[PDB]
Design a protein around this ligand. Structure first.
Ligand SMILES: CCCCCCCCCCCCCCCCCC(=O)OC[C@H](COP(=O)([O-])OCC(O)COP(=O)([O-])OC[C@@H](COC(=O)CCCCCCCCCCCCCCCCC)OC(=O)CCCCCCCCCCCCCCCCC)OC(=O)CCCCCCCCCCCCCCCCC
Ligand SMILES: CCCCCCCCCCCCCCCCCC(=O)OC[C@H](COP(=O)([O-])OCC[N+](C)(C)C)OC(=O)CCCCCCCCCCCCCCCCC
Ligand SMILES: CCCCCCCCCCCCCC(=O)SCCNC(=O)CCNC(=O)[C@@H](O)C(C)(C)COP(=O)(O)O
Ligand code: SF4
Ligand code: SF4
Lengths: 113, 82, 380, 31, 176, 96, 208, 114
């Protein structure tokens, strides 16, 4: 129907939201395959990305895709997919599935003192 | 900057303008810390007076190794042609 | 090279790097009203700490009272009585009218439109009469307290609030006749201070500073407090993120505050106005002078104060300047261990440097107007 | 009990919308 | 539950374009603003004639402090120091002793009116209605130390303003 | 209220509104400065029986925070809450 | 316990506990504690090396989207060897939720600045520099924001006194506002207000 | 005993940063005396800079002298940019403060302070 505005300032209307979400979700899965399988970030993000990708592949309509992705406008769903891709690329470098780097001191989180 | 003798005389002129150094004990090979009895910051403001006179910035790694007027005139000779 | 203007000492110091007419850098120097409020709070009881909140956003007194009261009541695990909650929502929207009159009319006064200032401050004087009739003070009421409110409404106050509210929309209409369609007012606000939605979220903006950019967020709707889920109102949403849509959002919030005030006047319940836990709220003076337990509780609440159970909350309200938060840490004693005050104007004035890039020097006073900045809450 | 309360039927309707009353001639008529 | 301020697309027929061109060239909204300013020119102004006319106040009004008495001349203050305990500014300084008939009475009752935040926590903490924040607001001074009230000043304020303070308390004590 | 009808008509014409119906100056319509005395109600804890304070002690039902994780399968990924419901446009006045 | 007691929200408590488990198992490298208060607020207590990886997670993860930094706070607790407790309050507008991220530092260990995650942090941690003395590494313009320009010390430290060490007055000899050691005409009266009876048995600490 | 550094790995890099901060203050003192139109000399301001550097001369911790260099750079930034007024620059010279009693006997005469 070619939505005129997203309503959010600085968030332009995406012309082809379905193909853009398919590209972003397969790119998230490609980046996310470089994480070990036992990492919870990989399991959880593959789970939610496969759910969103199946919803995108199942719905031709743009408005109904917005109501069942449940993330607002379709352009901020695209923006969140970009943020998840950037996050996964950072999580490869951080490697935060590793064990805890240091225990806190024994009364560090004791409240009240 | 032309001859080494003029650079040495100008180094000694800068050091005799510096009021904490005794001009009677001020020689070319006199050490600042253990002979002339100076603080490190005294040597730092000596090096800044040398930068004022000779017109080039002396970095920190090669100003810490300037502990006598002979080292100063050799450093100014090495950063120029002479 | 480029010009550096030190606009010296609300009160604000500004360090401008200008490149002719354009603004290259805006560095707001603050602390000119830093009074160390939240260090003073650590040496006072919770009741004693309450009147500091009147003096942070000093055009939004009972709203900051409400935010601090909600924080203390959350840590105390008690709730105010329903009539207290309706009085808090009524006076919170009267307070919102006070603050948006102050915001819009001083923002017009700093641009050059000096007359609707004088027109709307008589209405503001009548609302200060409402504060004075309910508490005894025109501005710093110390009225909304942890446990409810201090004192019940005097007889005949709601009729006068009705007589104010019945006429106030015409005052908004003639303000809007002076400014909204005026081409001089539009030339000072329409392309000025454009904030994208993502930058407004990232820079910690709240309130109209989000809603002018099209972000559908209002804490009275999304994270509702006292009885705001029982009142019906709309949330004005901007479309261009500029000074003009934020102006229109504040005008329409005055409209919706009048709507909420009508609903509060019609739905005011009977009953008590303090929580009937006399280990938190002081008993009535007639039973203080008659009952032994009531006299003991009066004594201890006005000397020691109530003990608050240990823990930390972040309690936020939709104040008329945006999200007003208290991060309150209790150690178990009757005095706050820590009270961080989150003010909207702090992050808004931090975003002033991005908002002023590419604009003129006369646009900066408009951007400092559209960010409703009171330096009491900015500096604490 | 006697308390500050609304009246029995409640208060009357309170206007809260924009009323810019659209006065003046048409743009054809003003030229 | 939300509305869009400023999301109107203007009509582009020749009627509305000519309306906007007439507004641009013939300054219509500027004459509207002049009409609104002219309308307030012929209104009665809101100005009261101070000092002959006064701003309206309530009996709850928090003004100048006073120490009160019983209806026998005995002062109400029994030196319990609740008012200085609750005082958020620490504006109240109290010293006490038994006086010559053994009564628990103050020897020092100071209120620094320049520390005081005028919030009235002292009058609501007072168990005997001794300290009140009375109705006077017209007590500006020429010197700072004239606002450092001792017990003699506060008892004279009580004796000065009691005819008004007692009637304001009579109007409001059932709300307290 | 004391304005003559010529000035009143000029004033209503210049504002474009009926100004006498909604005057910003207050008159006899406001409440009396002397009111009858109130009789304020009491709260729910003003009872002579079944009113033990331990059955209504709010501060003593506050608990320390429940430690979910401390350092001394195919479970569903979760969010902190369900996603927020999309706001509906105003039926009252959407400006559409 | 109906009228005077705050009603407990068990649904939000269960949801925030599940999301705290979620965050603790996605990021076990830095998460030290996860707790949910009785008024349903989630606290993630982390190691200070994970300021940037945790906050970037909560900002960018599709099940978190904590896009708003509501507040950034330090708390001085002098009985801890890491006396400063850095507190991040985050708002997710997508999931209508708030989270608290807590970490710690002493006087000398720098905390990594989170301006690359939230630009909102730019002044807040700057305030934490001014009030507490916590240095933030890789901050763009870290300097004082609230105290006077030549102010010595960090005022919101609990060993800093209420009135400071200096006070200002105009001196007419030097024609200048001058700073002198503080003398008070009336000392601030310290009130010992704590009852010697236990108030909350649920918060009783185990004895020695 | 393994702590995280601020800028300096040891005391030599720390002394390098101290030395550069002293160079920058030494260069700035004449401009500070000029543009604040101070009533002190350049020699007196440089003696005050030397006094403030020698006051902290006992510190052997690299993190503490890193924070001292950071705070000295902040004071220098507040001086070069005219953010301080003349009063803030002259607060280093405690001119209106009367000299404290130094020996035992005058402190005995004036009061109770040790
Ligand atoms: C145009 C030129 C001025 C014409 C006179 C005028 O406008 O009189 C106001 C008169 C009353 O106006 P209003 O605002 O409806 O009166 C409300 C008052 O509250 C109603 O008035 P009031 O109840 O307050 O009556 C008391 C008032 C009575 O008011 C007067 O006497 C008005 C002054 C008349 C001259 O007297 C005073 O207050 C003493 C005024 C003394 C100073 C007068 C200075 C006059 C300027 C020239 C010197 O205006 C009209 O009747 C309409 C205009 C008539 C124009 C006639 C053709 C010219
Ligand atoms: C003796 C009395 C003298 C004064 C009389 C007026 C008194 C009252 C004045 C009240 C207002 C005062 C406000 C002060 C600030 C004014 C600002 C302002 O208006 O700026 C000017 C504004 C500026 O408009 P603008 O820039 O805001 O509007 C945007 C315009 N665009 C989109 C193009 C960028 O208007 C003008 O420039 C108009 C100038 C005067 C035109 C007069 C009418 C000419 C009509 C000719 C006939 C046309 C017929 C159709 C065509 C066919 C021709 C054959
Ligand atoms: C006009 C008034 C302006 C006032 C300016 C105030 C600036 C204050 C800046 C303070 C910065 C410092 O004090 S950092 C110094 C701390 N350094 C140390 O503790 C290490 C010991 N350092 C020294 O002894 C220094 O003299 C040297 C030069 C680094 C080494 O000397 P030693 O060798 O012999
Ligand atoms: S009104 Fe408040 S600040 Fe003033 S003396 Fe009473 S308690 Fe203290
Ligand atoms: S609270 Fe009342 S009785 Fe007690 S010391 Fe104060 S004025 Fe006197």
């Amino acid at each position: 129907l070619l939505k005129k505005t997203t309503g959010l300032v600085g968030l332009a209307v995406c012309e082809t939201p379905h193909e853009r979400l398919k590209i972003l979700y397969t790119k998230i899965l490609d980046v996310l395959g470089h994480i070990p399988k036992n990492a919870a970030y990989r399991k959880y993000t593959e789970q939610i990305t496969n759910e969103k990708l199946s919803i995108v592949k199942a719905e031709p309509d743009v408005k109904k895709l917005e109501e069942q992705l449940q993330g607002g406008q379709i352009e901020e769903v695209i923006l969140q997919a970009e943020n998840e891709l950037s996050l996964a690329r950072k999580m490869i470098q951080w490697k935060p599935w590793e064990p805890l780097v240091e225990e806190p001191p024994a009364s560090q989180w004791k409240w009240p003192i | 900057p032309l001859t080494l003798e003029g650079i040495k005389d100008r180094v000694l002129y800068v050091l005799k303008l510096y009021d904490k150094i005794d001009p009677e004990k001020l020689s070319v090979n006199s050490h600042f810390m253990k002979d002339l009895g100076l603080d490190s910051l005294d040597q730092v403001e000596i090096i800044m007076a040398m930068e004022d006179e000779f017109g080039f910035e002396i970095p920190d790694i090669d100003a810490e190794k300037l502990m006598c007027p002979q080292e100063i005139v050799d450093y100014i000779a090495d950063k120029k042609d002479v | 090279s480029n010009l550096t203007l030190n606009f010296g000492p609300g009160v604000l110091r500004l360090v401008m790097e200008l490149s002719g007419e354009m603004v290259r850098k805006c560095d707001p120097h603050i602390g000119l009203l830093h009074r160390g409020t939240e260090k003073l709070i650590e040496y006072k009881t919770y009741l004693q700490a309450l009147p500091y909140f009147d003096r942070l956003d000093y055009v939004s007194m009972m709203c900051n009272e409400q935010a601090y009261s909600l924080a203390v009541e959350k840590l105390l695990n008690i709730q105010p009585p329903p009539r207290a909650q309706w009085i808090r929502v009524l006076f919170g929207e009267i307070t919102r009218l006070l603050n948006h009159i102050m915001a819009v009319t001083t923002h017009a006064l700093d641009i050059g439109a000096m007359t609707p200032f004088f027109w709307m401050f008589e209405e503001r004087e009548k609302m200060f009469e409402f504060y004075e009739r309910v508490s005894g003070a025109r501005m710093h009421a110390a009225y909304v307290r942890p446990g409810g409110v201090h004192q019940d409404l005097p007889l005949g106050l709601m009729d006068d609030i009705y007589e104010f509210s019945k006429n106030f929309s015409l005052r908004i209409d003639e303000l809007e006749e002076m400014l909204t369609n005026n081409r001089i007012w539009r030339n000072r606000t329409v392309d000025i201070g454009v904030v994208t939605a993502e930058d407004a979220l990232n820079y910690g903006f709240s309130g109209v500073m989000l809603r002018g950019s099209g972000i559908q967020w209002d804490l009275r709707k999304t994270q509702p407090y006292d009885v705001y889920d029982q009142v019906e109102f709309d949330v004005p949403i901007g479309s261009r993120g500029d000074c003009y849509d934020r102006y229109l959002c504040r005008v329409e919030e005055m409209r919706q505050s009048i709507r909420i005030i009508s609903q509060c006047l019609n739905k005011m319940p009977p009953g008590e106005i303090k929580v009937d836990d006399a280990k938190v709220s002081p008993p009535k003076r007639a039973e203080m002078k008659t009952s032994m337990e009531s006299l003991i509780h009066h004594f201890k609440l006005y000397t020691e104060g109530y003990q608050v159970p240990p823990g930390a909350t972040y309690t936020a309200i939709e104040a008329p300047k945006g999200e007003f938060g208290v991060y309150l840490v209790s150690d178990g004693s009757s005095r706050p261990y820590r009270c961080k005050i989150k003010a909207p104007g702090f992050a808004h004035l931090a975003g002033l440097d991005k908002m002023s890039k590419g604009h003129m020097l006369a646009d900066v006073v408009a951007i400092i107007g559209t960010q409703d900045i009171v330096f009491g809450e900015v500096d604490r | 009990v006697k308390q500050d309360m609304p009246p029995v039927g409640g208060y009357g309707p309170i206007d809260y919308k924009r009323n810019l009353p659209r006065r003046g001639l048409s743009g054809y008529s003003m030229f | 539950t939300y509305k869009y301020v400023n999301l109107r697309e203007p009509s582009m027929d020749m009627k509305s374009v000519t309306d906007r061109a007439a507004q641009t060239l013939l300054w219509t909204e500027l004459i509207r603003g002049l009409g609104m300013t002219l309308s307030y020119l012929f209104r009665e102004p809101a100005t009261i004639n101070y000092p002959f006319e006064k701003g309206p106040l309530s009996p709850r009004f928090r003004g100048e402090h006073a120490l009160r008495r019983y209806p026998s001349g005995e002062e109400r203050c029994i030196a319990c120091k609740l008012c200085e305990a609750v005082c958020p500014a620490q504006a109240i300084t109290i010293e006490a002793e038994p006086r010559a008939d053994g009564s628990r009475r103050t020897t020092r009752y100071d209120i620094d009116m320049t520390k005081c935040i005028y919030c009235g926590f002292c009058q609501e903490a007072c168990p005997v209605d001794a300290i009140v924040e009375g109705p006077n607001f017209e007590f500006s001074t020429e010197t700072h130390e004239e606002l450092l009230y001792n017990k003699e000043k506060l008892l004279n304020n009580g004796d000065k303003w009691e005819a008004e303070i007692a009637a304001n308390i009579q109007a409001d004590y059932l709300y307290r | 209220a004391s304005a003559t009808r010529l000035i009143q008509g000029l004033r209503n014409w210049a504002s474009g509104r009926d100004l006498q119906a909604k005057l910003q100056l207050r008159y006899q319509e406001i409440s009396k400065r002397t009111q009858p005395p109130p009789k304020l109600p009491v709260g729910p804890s003003h009872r002579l029986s079944n009113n033990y304070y331990c059955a209504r002690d709010g501060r003593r039902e506050a608990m320390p925070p429940s430690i979910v994780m401390s350092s001394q399968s195919e479970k569903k990924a979760v969010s902190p809450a369900p996603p927020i419901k999309r706001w509906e446009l105003s039926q009252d006045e959407p400006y559409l | 316990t109906r009228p005077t007691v705050r009603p407990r929200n068990d649904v939000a408590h269960k949801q925030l506990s599940a999301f705290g488990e979620y965050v603790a198992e996605i990021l076990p490298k830095y998460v030290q504690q996860v707790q949910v208060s009785c008024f349903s607020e989630l606290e993630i207590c982390i190691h200070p090396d994970g300021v940037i990886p945790v906050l970037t997670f909560l900002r960018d993860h599709s099940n978190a989207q904590f896009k708003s930094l509501a507040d950034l706070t330090a708390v001085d607790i002098p009985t801890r060897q890491n006396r400063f407790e850095i507190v991040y309050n985050l708002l997710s507008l997508r999931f209508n939720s708030r989270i608290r991220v807590k970490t710690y530092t002493d006087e000398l260990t720098p905390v990594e600045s989170s301006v690359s995650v939230y630009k909102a942090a730019n002044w807040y941690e700057r305030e934490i520099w001014d009030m507490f003395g916590v240095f933030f590494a890789n901050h763009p313009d870290l300097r004082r924001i609230l105290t006077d320009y030549g102010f010595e010390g960090h005022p919101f430290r609990k060993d800093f006194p209420l009135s400071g060490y200096v006070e200002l007055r105009y001196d007419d000899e030097v024609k200048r506002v001058v700073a002198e050691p503080v003398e008070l005409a009336q000392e601030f009266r310290k009130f010992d207000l704590n009852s010697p009876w236990e108030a909350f048995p649920a918060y009783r600490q185990p004895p020695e | 005993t393994s702590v995280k550094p601020i800028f300096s790995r040891d005391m030599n890099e720390a002394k390098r940063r101290v030395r550069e901060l002293y160079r920058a203050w030494y260069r700035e003192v004449p401009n500070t005396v000029h543009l604040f139109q101070l009533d002190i000399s350049v020699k007196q301001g440089r003696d005050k800079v030397r006094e403030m550097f020698k006051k902290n001369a006992h510190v052997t911790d690299p993190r503490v002298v890193d924070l001292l260099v950071i705070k000295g750079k902040m004071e220098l930034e507040e001086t070069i940019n005219v953010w301080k007024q003349r009063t803030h620059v002259m607060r280093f010279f405690h001119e209106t403060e009367a000299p404290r009693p130094k020996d035992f006997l005058s402190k005995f005469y004036v009061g109770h302070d040790p």
